[PDB]
Amino acid sequence: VEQASDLILDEKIKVTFDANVAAGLPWEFVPVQRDIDVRIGETVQIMYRAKNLASTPTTGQATFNVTPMAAGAYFNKVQCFCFTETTLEPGEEMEMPVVFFVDPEIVKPVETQGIKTLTLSYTFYPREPSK
């Protein structure tokens, strides 16, 4: 419920935020850490910063894959309305909080059965004018 307060058994989930950026998004999209720990629900705060380094505005409606492979399904809050990243003029600092906690239901099916690093491959690469 964008908390977990039952699901939080003291079992450690790792998560590994592979934040990639390419030309298409000429924004200084810094990961906070490459990774986090959550105890399977432990509802953390991890911000992100994207500072625009272009000479004209861009958009930033970037694709993400929230899975090492098997899981994805067991990611809590795979999408929502009001995408954080969006649009910036040539200079400005976007920064936004994120919250992330893996569902312990991951440790149920044969699918995953050991899988517990909900790796978020972010690919910041829509369209660049000329930075």
PDB file of C-alpha atoms in Angstrom:
ATOM      1  CA  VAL A   1       0.000   0.000   0.000  1.00  0.00           C
ATOM      2  CA  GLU A   2       3.183   2.021  -0.560  1.00  0.00           C
ATOM      3  CA  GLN A   3       3.985   0.736   2.873  1.00  0.00           C
ATOM      4  CA  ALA A   4       4.759  -2.810   3.849  1.00  0.00           C
ATOM      5  CA  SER A   5       4.145  -3.588   7.562  1.00  0.00           C
ATOM      6  CA  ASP A   6       3.412  -7.334   7.647  1.00  0.00           C
ATOM      7  CA  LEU A   7       5.382  -8.512   4.602  1.00  0.00           C
ATOM      8  CA  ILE A   8       8.582  -7.172   6.236  1.00  0.00           C
ATOM      9  CA  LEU A   9      10.131 -10.332   7.565  1.00  0.00           C
ATOM     10  CA  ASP A  10      13.845  -9.765   8.336  1.00  0.00           C
ATOM     11  CA  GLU A  11      14.872 -11.499   5.080  1.00  0.00           C
ATOM     12  CA  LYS A  12      17.137  -9.313   2.957  1.00  0.00           C
ATOM     13  CA  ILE A  13      16.230  -8.415  -0.598  1.00  0.00           C
ATOM     14  CA  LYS A  14      18.930  -6.613  -2.633  1.00  0.00           C
ATOM     15  CA  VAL A  15      17.932  -4.282  -5.518  1.00  0.00           C
ATOM     16  CA  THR A  16      20.329  -3.048  -8.187  1.00  0.00           C
ATOM     17  CA  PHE A  17      19.419   0.194  -9.962  1.00  0.00           C
ATOM     18  CA  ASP A  18      21.239   0.062 -13.283  1.00  0.00           C
ATOM     19  CA  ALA A  19      20.663   3.700 -14.282  1.00  0.00           C
ATOM     20  CA  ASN A  20      21.874   4.043 -17.924  1.00  0.00           C
ATOM     21  CA  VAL A  21      21.851   7.265 -19.961  1.00  0.00           C
ATOM     22  CA  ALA A  22      22.769   7.906 -23.618  1.00  0.00           C
ATOM     23  CA  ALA A  23      22.780  10.906 -26.023  1.00  0.00           C
ATOM     24  CA  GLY A  24      18.966  10.751 -26.405  1.00  0.00           C
ATOM     25  CA  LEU A  25      18.709  12.128 -22.829  1.00  0.00           C
ATOM     26  CA  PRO A  26      21.574  14.688 -22.450  1.00  0.00           C
ATOM     27  CA  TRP A  27      20.764  15.037 -18.721  1.00  0.00           C
ATOM     28  CA  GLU A  28      23.135  14.374 -15.824  1.00  0.00           C
ATOM     29  CA  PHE A  29      21.025  11.461 -14.589  1.00  0.00           C
ATOM     30  CA  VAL A  30      22.918  10.401 -11.463  1.00  0.00           C
ATOM     31  CA  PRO A  31      22.045   7.201  -9.575  1.00  0.00           C
ATOM     32  CA  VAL A  32      22.085   7.728  -5.790  1.00  0.00           C
ATOM     33  CA  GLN A  33      23.696   4.339  -5.191  1.00  0.00           C
ATOM     34  CA  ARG A  34      23.972   1.546  -7.783  1.00  0.00           C
ATOM     35  CA  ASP A  35      21.882  -0.563  -5.401  1.00  0.00           C
ATOM     36  CA  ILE A  36      19.776  -0.755  -2.226  1.00  0.00           C
ATOM     37  CA  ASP A  37      18.849  -3.331   0.385  1.00  0.00           C
ATOM     38  CA  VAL A  38      15.182  -3.694   1.427  1.00  0.00           C
ATOM     39  CA  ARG A  39      13.854  -6.296   3.869  1.00  0.00           C
ATOM     40  CA  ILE A  40      11.150  -7.525   1.460  1.00  0.00           C
ATOM     41  CA  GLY A  41       8.809  -4.546   1.963  1.00  0.00           C
ATOM     42  CA  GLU A  42      11.039  -2.082   3.870  1.00  0.00           C
ATOM     43  CA  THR A  43       9.728   1.067   2.223  1.00  0.00           C
ATOM     44  CA  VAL A  44      12.838   3.193   1.533  1.00  0.00           C
ATOM     45  CA  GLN A  45      13.487   6.680   0.040  1.00  0.00           C
ATOM     46  CA  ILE A  46      15.939   6.897  -2.869  1.00  0.00           C
ATOM     47  CA  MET A  47      15.986  10.176  -4.806  1.00  0.00           C
ATOM     48  CA  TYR A  48      17.218  10.734  -8.387  1.00  0.00           C
ATOM     49  CA  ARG A  49      18.755  13.870  -9.982  1.00  0.00           C
ATOM     50  CA  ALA A  50      18.651  14.716 -13.735  1.00  0.00           C
ATOM     51  CA  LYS A  51      20.250  18.071 -14.633  1.00  0.00           C
ATOM     52  CA  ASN A  52      19.832  19.126 -18.301  1.00  0.00           C
ATOM     53  CA  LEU A  53      23.154  19.831 -20.132  1.00  0.00           C
ATOM     54  CA  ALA A  54      21.654  20.545 -23.606  1.00  0.00           C
ATOM     55  CA  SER A  55      21.459  23.976 -25.325  1.00  0.00           C
ATOM     56  CA  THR A  56      17.728  23.520 -26.139  1.00  0.00           C
ATOM     57  CA  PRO A  57      14.955  21.771 -24.145  1.00  0.00           C
ATOM     58  CA  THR A  58      14.593  17.968 -24.131  1.00  0.00           C
ATOM     59  CA  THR A  59      12.014  15.412 -23.087  1.00  0.00           C
ATOM     60  CA  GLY A  60      12.833  12.493 -20.772  1.00  0.00           C
ATOM     61  CA  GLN A  61      10.084   9.859 -20.914  1.00  0.00           C
ATOM     62  CA  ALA A  62      12.613   7.062 -20.618  1.00  0.00           C
ATOM     63  CA  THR A  63      12.121   3.296 -20.639  1.00  0.00           C
ATOM     64  CA  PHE A  64      12.874   1.106 -17.605  1.00  0.00           C
ATOM     65  CA  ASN A  65      12.965  -2.687 -17.056  1.00  0.00           C
ATOM     66  CA  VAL A  66      12.431  -3.542 -13.361  1.00  0.00           C
ATOM     67  CA  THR A  67      13.731  -7.139 -13.363  1.00  0.00           C
ATOM     68  CA  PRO A  68      16.971  -9.162 -13.439  1.00  0.00           C
ATOM     69  CA  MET A  69      14.896 -11.442 -15.733  1.00  0.00           C
ATOM     70  CA  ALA A  70      12.433 -13.787 -13.986  1.00  0.00           C
ATOM     71  CA  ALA A  71      10.577 -11.450 -11.664  1.00  0.00           C
ATOM     72  CA  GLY A  72       9.229  -8.046 -12.800  1.00  0.00           C
ATOM     73  CA  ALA A  73       5.694  -9.126 -11.756  1.00  0.00           C
ATOM     74  CA  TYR A  74       6.799  -9.166  -8.097  1.00  0.00           C
ATOM     75  CA  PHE A  75       7.951  -5.501  -8.333  1.00  0.00           C
ATOM     76  CA  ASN A  76       5.838  -3.205  -6.193  1.00  0.00           C
ATOM     77  CA  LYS A  77       4.548  -0.150  -8.129  1.00  0.00           C
ATOM     78  CA  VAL A  78       5.764  -1.029 -11.650  1.00  0.00           C
ATOM     79  CA  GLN A  79       4.184   2.228 -12.904  1.00  0.00           C
ATOM     80  CA  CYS A  80       1.947   5.075 -11.669  1.00  0.00           C
ATOM     81  CA  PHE A  81       0.403   8.311 -12.983  1.00  0.00           C
ATOM     82  CA  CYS A  82       2.571  11.473 -12.843  1.00  0.00           C
ATOM     83  CA  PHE A  83       5.862  10.217 -14.302  1.00  0.00           C
ATOM     84  CA  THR A  84       8.720  11.914 -12.389  1.00  0.00           C
ATOM     85  CA  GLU A  85      11.037  12.634 -15.324  1.00  0.00           C
ATOM     86  CA  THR A  86       9.346  14.504 -18.230  1.00  0.00           C
ATOM     87  CA  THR A  87      10.695  17.693 -19.867  1.00  0.00           C
ATOM     88  CA  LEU A  88      13.444  20.275 -19.113  1.00  0.00           C
ATOM     89  CA  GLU A  89      14.892  23.483 -20.569  1.00  0.00           C
ATOM     90  CA  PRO A  90      18.666  23.738 -21.295  1.00  0.00           C
ATOM     91  CA  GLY A  91      20.231  23.810 -17.835  1.00  0.00           C
ATOM     92  CA  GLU A  92      17.687  22.973 -15.209  1.00  0.00           C
ATOM     93  CA  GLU A  93      17.809  20.497 -12.295  1.00  0.00           C
ATOM     94  CA  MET A  94      15.085  17.888 -12.114  1.00  0.00           C
ATOM     95  CA  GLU A  95      15.237  15.937  -8.895  1.00  0.00           C
ATOM     96  CA  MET A  96      12.531  13.586  -7.627  1.00  0.00           C
ATOM     97  CA  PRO A  97      12.121  11.028  -4.805  1.00  0.00           C
ATOM     98  CA  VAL A  98      11.580   7.360  -5.640  1.00  0.00           C
ATOM     99  CA  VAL A  99      10.437   4.606  -3.242  1.00  0.00           C
ATOM    100  CA  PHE A 100      10.985   0.915  -3.989  1.00  0.00           C
ATOM    101  CA  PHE A 101      10.436  -2.337  -2.061  1.00  0.00           C
ATOM    102  CA  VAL A 102      10.408  -5.881  -3.472  1.00  0.00           C
ATOM    103  CA  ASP A 103       7.397  -8.112  -2.712  1.00  0.00           C
ATOM    104  CA  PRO A 104       8.237 -11.300  -0.720  1.00  0.00           C
ATOM    105  CA  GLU A 105       5.827 -13.128  -3.112  1.00  0.00           C
ATOM    106  CA  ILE A 106       8.973 -13.292  -5.293  1.00  0.00           C
ATOM    107  CA  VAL A 107      10.108 -16.217  -3.048  1.00  0.00           C
ATOM    108  CA  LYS A 108       7.182 -18.449  -4.109  1.00  0.00           C
ATOM    109  CA  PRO A 109       7.149 -19.760  -7.749  1.00  0.00           C
ATOM    110  CA  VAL A 110       9.607 -21.998  -9.642  1.00  0.00           C
ATOM    111  CA  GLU A 111       9.956 -18.963 -11.981  1.00  0.00           C
ATOM    112  CA  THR A 112      12.106 -17.063  -9.522  1.00  0.00           C
ATOM    113  CA  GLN A 113      12.965 -19.593  -6.766  1.00  0.00           C
ATOM    114  CA  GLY A 114      16.167 -17.801  -5.648  1.00  0.00           C
ATOM    115  CA  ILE A 115      15.825 -14.642  -7.761  1.00  0.00           C
ATOM    116  CA  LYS A 116      15.965 -11.696  -5.398  1.00  0.00           C
ATOM    117  CA  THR A 117      17.686  -8.715  -6.978  1.00  0.00           C
ATOM    118  CA  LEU A 118      14.969  -6.644  -8.600  1.00  0.00           C
ATOM    119  CA  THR A 119      17.389  -5.010 -11.001  1.00  0.00           C
ATOM    120  CA  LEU A 120      16.032  -1.808 -12.521  1.00  0.00           C
ATOM    121  CA  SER A 121      17.669  -1.275 -15.916  1.00  0.00           C
ATOM    122  CA  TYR A 122      16.776   2.375 -16.648  1.00  0.00           C
ATOM    123  CA  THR A 123      17.583   3.468 -20.233  1.00  0.00           C
ATOM    124  CA  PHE A 124      17.618   7.273 -20.492  1.00  0.00           C
ATOM    125  CA  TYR A 125      17.657   7.532 -24.342  1.00  0.00           C
ATOM    126  CA  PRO A 126      14.574   9.208 -26.024  1.00  0.00           C
ATOM    127  CA  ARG A 127      15.564  12.094 -28.382  1.00  0.00           C
ATOM    128  CA  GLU A 128      18.335  14.745 -28.254  1.00  0.00           C
ATOM    129  CA  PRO A 129      18.310  17.898 -30.463  1.00  0.00           C
ATOM    130  CA  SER A 130      22.044  18.870 -30.211  1.00  0.00           C
ATOM    131  CA  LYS A 131      23.817  19.109 -26.812  1.00  0.00           C
TER     132      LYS A 131
END
